[PDB]
A paper describes a structure:
The adenosine A2A receptor (A2AR) is an archetypical Class A G-protein-coupled receptor (GPCR). A2AR is activated by the endogenous agonist adenosine and plays a prominent role in cardiac function, the immune system and central nervous system, including the release of the major excitatory neurotransmitter glutamate. Given the widespread tissue distribution and physiological relevance of A2AR, it is a validated drug target for many disorders, including Parkinson’s disease and cancer. In terms of the interactions between a heterotrimeric G protein and a Class A GPCR, the vast majority of interactions are made by the α subunit, in particular the C-terminal α5 helix.
In this work, we used a construct of A2AR that contained thioredoxin at the N-terminus of the receptor. The presence of thioredoxin did not significantly affect the pharmacology of A2AR, as assessed by determination of its apparent KD for the inverse agonist ZM241385 or in agonist shift assays. It could also be purified to homogeneity and coupled effectively to both mini-GS and to the heterotrimer containing mini-GS, β1, γ2 and Nb35. In order to circumvent this problem, we performed refinement with the original particles and then exchanging them for their signal subtracted equivalent (without micelle and thioredoxin) only in the last iteration of refinement. This resulted in the best overall map at 4.11 Å resolution with quality density throughout. The receptor and mini-Gs portions of the A2AR–G protein complex are very similar to the crystal structure of the A2AR–mini-GS complex, with the RMSD of Cα atoms for the receptor and mini-GS components being 0.5 Å and 0.6 Å, respectively. The density for NECA is of sufficient quality to allow an unambiguous orientation of NECA and the same interactions to the receptor are observed as present in the crystal structures. In the cryo-EM structure this region is more disordered. As a consequence, there is no significant side chain density for Phe168 and Glu169 in the cryo-EM map. At a more physiological pH of 7.5 that was used for the cryo-EM structure, His264 would be predominantly deprotonated and unable to form the ionic bridge. No interactions were observed between A2AR and the γ subunit, but potential interactions were observed between ICL1 (residues Ser35, Asn36 and Gln38) of A2AR and the β subunit (Arg52, Asp312, Asp333 and Phe335). Firstly, contacts between A2AR and the heterotrimeric G protein were identified between ICL1 and the β subunit, and between ICL2 and part of the N-terminal α-helix of the α subunit; these regions of the G protein were either absent or disordered, respectively, in the crystal structure.
Residue numbers in the entry:
A (entry chain C): 11 to 54
B (entry chain A): 7 to 146, 164 to 211, 224 to 299
C (entry chain D): 12 to 57, 206 to 384
D (entry chain B): 5 to 340
E (entry chain E): 1 to 128
Write the structure that this text describes.
């Protein structure tokens, strides 16, 4: 349990932690791109 | 006269009350059910009273020259549609009754298909009894109620089957519901008991308040007319108060169900 | 194309017909969540999950919850259409009876199980009487309120039942019904019963209990109690 | 003692690493852009049919037919455009907490307290619906199922473990162990290479399908994560929970970028889903309503008023034209 | 990360006293019903005592009724248990355990190990 949880968090430690400003801007820009893409927002 | 103003007010009150109840069932999910169709069938009759049994009842009080078949058809059709309110009123009492004495088998015994069937029994039997004067039992011109409709029909067959039987059934049925309420409440006592008795007394008492006054005058008129007839205003009081059932039927049933309160 | 839209619609009428036939049998049948504990007379009254039984022209559908694991906050939510939760408990097991009292308080005060009545079965009543008359494991140690608790006046024990056992019998109820009365609502009522494995007539006790619940449900609908 | 101390230090180091990544906040940078504004989705139709409470539902890839499981034991295959019964399948166990439509539009899944994700074949040459394969290999209640393809299906359960299954073989191929409490929901990615899963330990986990291991463990919830759904791009996901808030977790950033919270709301979320745009985070709540959240700025754009009892499930179409909300009063209402 | 850290706990003579203190973190402490769960040597877990969100509707187990005293600090986010007159039977691993849902009065804790809203626990021991 402890060794498996340690090995889990050891694997979880090494990861490409991107910036929130860049991560937010990509998710924000994705909406702006697909906002026109006939969604629930502007009813057809 | 005072009857014409009072009845047309009773019409507008009956529609305003009845549609609002019918609107509430259609809007909400928990309301619409087997129980709702019995309440809405009473309310639907109340709508029918508001549009079809008030203005056609107004025409009988005037005394206008017409054919004897044409005049009698109006007075009988007024009786039919007012009678459908009473049979639907009894049908709800039996619907509540069978839900309390047979609780576990209620949804098996009583269903939505059979609910329409019981509503169909009430409306068809209301048409059957009220159109009895059309074929047989009619002494048949100045279009009056007492002339065209015979008083032997009104006391023996009509008052017994269409009013007194509902009264004797409901009064006995709701006493048995109170016995079940007494059996349940003391287990779960005076304040809640008198509330339960008074609640069913409001349901039965307003039914007895509305219909009896007119029919006891018919029992008076039929049994012995040595004394004079009830004055026009006194007859108008009895006719309006009998129609006032259709105004208070929305109150005595639809107002009491807790789910209808939130919608209204 | 024109045939295809109506063809599925006429086929959906049969689906509706099968569904409406299913609604008739389902609405008539009553579901019951019989949950209990490890060695607490759960298997005696009913190790099957589902148990259908016809009593007095009324089909029941009593569902045990044994196969799944003890974390019961997200699978117990599945039983709020249920008519009555048959909560069975071991009367003799004093250490683990406190866990059942906590389990009762959780079931009673849950939002989704707020509308549900609990047909309580205090199982192992004759086996409780064996432990109480011996007096080895005192009730006062595991429940200090018992030492200052007298017998109820409205209590009705069976013939040849000792007042010593009667005190212990109606005290176990007290802690369960203290939680029952603490709601202050009246949406659901606890129905306590003193039961053993040998005492066969328990489905009759459920029948009379479930009668009063759905009676209460109808009376409450009309604002009459 | 030494292993427990090292495990605690790893959790502190993981939070400290992602804290450095948090330069800005999502709500802070999305304040400048204009919101969706006043949004008021009317009910298109009302799918009345189910007898008991509807626990789960899911759309197909076609964006027309939708399946929904109810506790009476029926798994009705609806048609949104025509509000009619395509199929009505009687289950083995009446209690069913999930159901899913296959991407091909051939198979349909369902399961609950029976501990079996029962797969049903729609396109049967004989005539009636038939049980394709019973996937009985879980200790506890089945909480969610999602088809990768017709060949294989991923599962969550009440045995503290998710699991990949292959219906052709009829046994679990890859197991997913890691959660502390029982898992409640899961969501596949657009690519179907990895999937997420929220559980009653209040910590979501990203699992890789091919490898069979947790990539990273997310934690930004106080109570049980009931539901979970992927963001359209596949780089983030939202999670409804019993703490009465939703939390967006970026897979790249590896932390809670945003919390969707209203202090007036005091009850948990049952289901969550995004639109095609990834703007309207549609979350279904316990208080008989569903709040239309703005995924951009974290503000309540609208609300879904309708149902008597709680909204249990919420699905969105693949084309993004319609939305459905199954509820405990048994009326599936479709909105667009 | 929804952790509860049990401070205090240790050895003490029979008849004495020992004040446990559980440091809570990772969530809004005031919104949840709190309780203590103990695990004796070679035994299953059992409920000891609970406390409401406001800190009013308090309850105890009969074995610990009058002797133990539960309390909570909603501001700094922590739970207490001032144990007095400790008997030999009271020896157990006392876990402080928050209830699963907020804004409520129901709890389905006392789980077979698997319950995330509960700490690692402190070994309270009684010997003479
Ligand atoms: C079902 C019973 N219906 C009636 O009594 C209705 O018939 C009419 N009616 C019956 N008897 C008389 C009468 N003697 N005079 C006037 N109207 C009457 C009233 O308008 C009542 O509304």
């Amino acid at each position: 349990q402890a060794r498996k949880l340690v090995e889990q968090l050891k694997m979880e430690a090494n990861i490409d932690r991107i910036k929130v400003s860049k991560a937010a801007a990509d998710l924000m820009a994705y909406c702006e791109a697909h906002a026109k893409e006939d969604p629930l927002l502007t009813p057809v | 006269a005072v009857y014409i103003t009072v009845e047309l007010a009773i019409a507008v009150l009956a529609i305003l009350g009845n549609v609002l109840v019918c609107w509430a069932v259609w809007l909400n999910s928990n309301l619409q059910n087997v129980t709702n169709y019995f309440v809405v069938s009473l309310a639907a009759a109340d709508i029918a009273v508001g549009v079809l049994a008030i203005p056609f009842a107004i025409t009988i009080s005037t005394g206008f020259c017409a054919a004897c078949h044409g005049c009698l058809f109006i007075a009988c059709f007024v009786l039919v549609l007012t009678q459908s309110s009473i049979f639907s009123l009894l049908a709800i009492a039996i619907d509540r009754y069978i839900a309390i004495r047979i609780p576990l088998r209620y949804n098996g015994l009583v269903t939505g298909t059979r609910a329409k069937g019981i509503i169909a029994i009430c409306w068809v039997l209301s048409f059957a009894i009220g159109l009895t004067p059309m074929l047989g039992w009619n002494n048949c011109v100045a279009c009056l109620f007492e002339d065209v409709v015979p008083m032997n029909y009104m006391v023996y067959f009509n008052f017994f089957a269409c009013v007194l039987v509902p009264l004797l059934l409901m009064l006995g049925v709701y006493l048995r519901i109170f016995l079940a309420a007494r059996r349940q409440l003391k287990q779960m006592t005076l304040q809640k008991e008198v509330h339960a008795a008074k609640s069913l007394a409001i349901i039965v008492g307003l039914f007895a308040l509305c219909w009896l006054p007119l029919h006891i005058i018919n029992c008076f008129t039929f049994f012995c007319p040595d004394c004079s007839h009830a004055p026009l205003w006194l007859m108008y009081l009895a006719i309006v108060l009998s129609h006032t059932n259709s105004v208070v039927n929305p109150f005595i049933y639809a107002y009491r169900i807790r789910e209808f309160r939130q919608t209204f | 194309q024109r045939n295809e839209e109506k063809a599925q619609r006429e086929a959906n009428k049969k689906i509706e017909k099968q569904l409406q036939k299913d609604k008739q049998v389902y609405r008539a049948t009553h579901r019951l969540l019989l949950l209990g504990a490890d060695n607490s007379g759960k298997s005696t009254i009913v190790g099957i999950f589902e148990t259908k039984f016809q009593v007095d022209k009324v089909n029941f559908h009593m569902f045990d919850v044994g196969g799944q694991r003890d974390e019961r906050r997200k699978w117990i939510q599945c039983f709020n259409d249920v008519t009555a939760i048959i909560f069975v408990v071991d009367s003799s097991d004093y250490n683990r009876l406190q866990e059942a009292l906590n389990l009762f308080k959780s079931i009673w005060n849950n939002r989704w199980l707020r509308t549900i009545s609990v047909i309580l079965f205090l199982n192992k009543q004759d086996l409780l009487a064996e432990k109480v008359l011996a007096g080895k494991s005192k009730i006062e140690d595991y429940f200090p309120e018992f030492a200052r608790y007298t017998t109820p006046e409205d209590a009705t024990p069976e013939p040849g039942e000792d007042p010593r056992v009667t005190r212990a019998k109606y005290f176990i109820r007290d802690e369960f019904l203290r939680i029952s009365t603490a709601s202050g609502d009246g949406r659901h009522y606890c129905y306590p019963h003193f039961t053993c494995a040998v005492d066969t007539e328990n489905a009759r006790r459920i029948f009379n209990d479930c009668r009063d619940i759905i009676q209460r449900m109808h009376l409450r609908q009309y604002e009459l109690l | 003692d030494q292993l427990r101390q090292e495990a605690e230090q790893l959790k502190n180091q993981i939070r400290d690493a992602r804290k450095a990544c948090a330069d800005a906040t999502l709500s802070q940078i999305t304040n400048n852009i204009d919101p969706v504004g006043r949004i008021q989705m009317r009910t298109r139709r009302t799918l009345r049919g189910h007898l008991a409470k509807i626990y789960a539902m899911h759309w197909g890839t076609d964006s027309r037919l939708l399946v929904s499981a109810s506790q009476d034991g029926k798994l009705i295959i609806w048609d949104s455009y025509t509000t009619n019964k395509v199929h009505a399948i009687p289950l083995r166990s009446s209690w069913v907490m999930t159901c899913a439509y296959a991407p091909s539009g051939n198979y349909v899944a369902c399961g609950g307290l029976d501990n079996i994700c029962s797969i049903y074949n729609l396109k049967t040459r004989e005539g009636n619906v038939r049980v394709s394969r019973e996937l009985a290999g879980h200790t506890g209640y089945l909480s969610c199922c999602r088809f990768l393809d017709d060949n294989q299906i991923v599962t969550s359960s009440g045995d503290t473990t998710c699991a990949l299954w292959d219906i052709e073989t009829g046994q679990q191929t890859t197991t997913f162990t890691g959660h502390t409490g029982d898992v409640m929901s899961l969501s596949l990615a657009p690519d179907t290479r990895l999937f997420v899963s929220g559980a009653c330990d209040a910590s979501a986990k990203l699992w890789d399908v091919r490898e069979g291991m947790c990539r990273q463990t997310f934690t930004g919830h106080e109570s049980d994560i009931n539901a979970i759904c992927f963001f359209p791009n596949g780089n983030a996901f939202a999670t409804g929970s019993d703490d009465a808030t939703c939390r967006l977790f970026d897979l790249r950033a590896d932390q809670e970028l945003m919390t969707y919270s209203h202090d007036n709301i005091i009850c948990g979320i049952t289901s969550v889903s995004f639109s095609k745009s990834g703007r309207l985070l549609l979350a279904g709540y316990d208080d008989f309503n569903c709040n239309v959240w703005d995924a951009l700025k974290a503000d309540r754009a609208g609300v879904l008023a309708g149902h008597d009892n709680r909204v249990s499930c919420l699905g969105v179409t693949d084309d993004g034209m319609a939305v459905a909300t199954g509820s405990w009063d048994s009326f599936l209402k479709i909105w667009n | 990360q929804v952790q509860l850290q049990e401070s205090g706990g240790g050895l003490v003579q029979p008849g004495g006293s020992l004040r446990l203190s559980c440091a809570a973190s990772g969530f809004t402490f005031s919104n949840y019903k709190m309780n203590w769960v103990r695990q004796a040597p070679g035994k299953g877990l059992e409920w000891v005592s609970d406390i409401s969100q406001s800190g009013a509707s308090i309850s105890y187990t009969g074995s610990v009724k009058g002797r133990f005293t539960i309390s909570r600090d909603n501001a700094k986010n922590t739970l207490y248990l001032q144990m007095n007159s400790l008997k030999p039977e009271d020896t157990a691993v006392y876990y402080c355990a928050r209830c699963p849902a907020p804004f409520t009065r129901d709890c389905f804790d006392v789980t077979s190990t698997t319950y995330a809203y509960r700490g690692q626990g402190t070994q309270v021991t009684v010997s003479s």
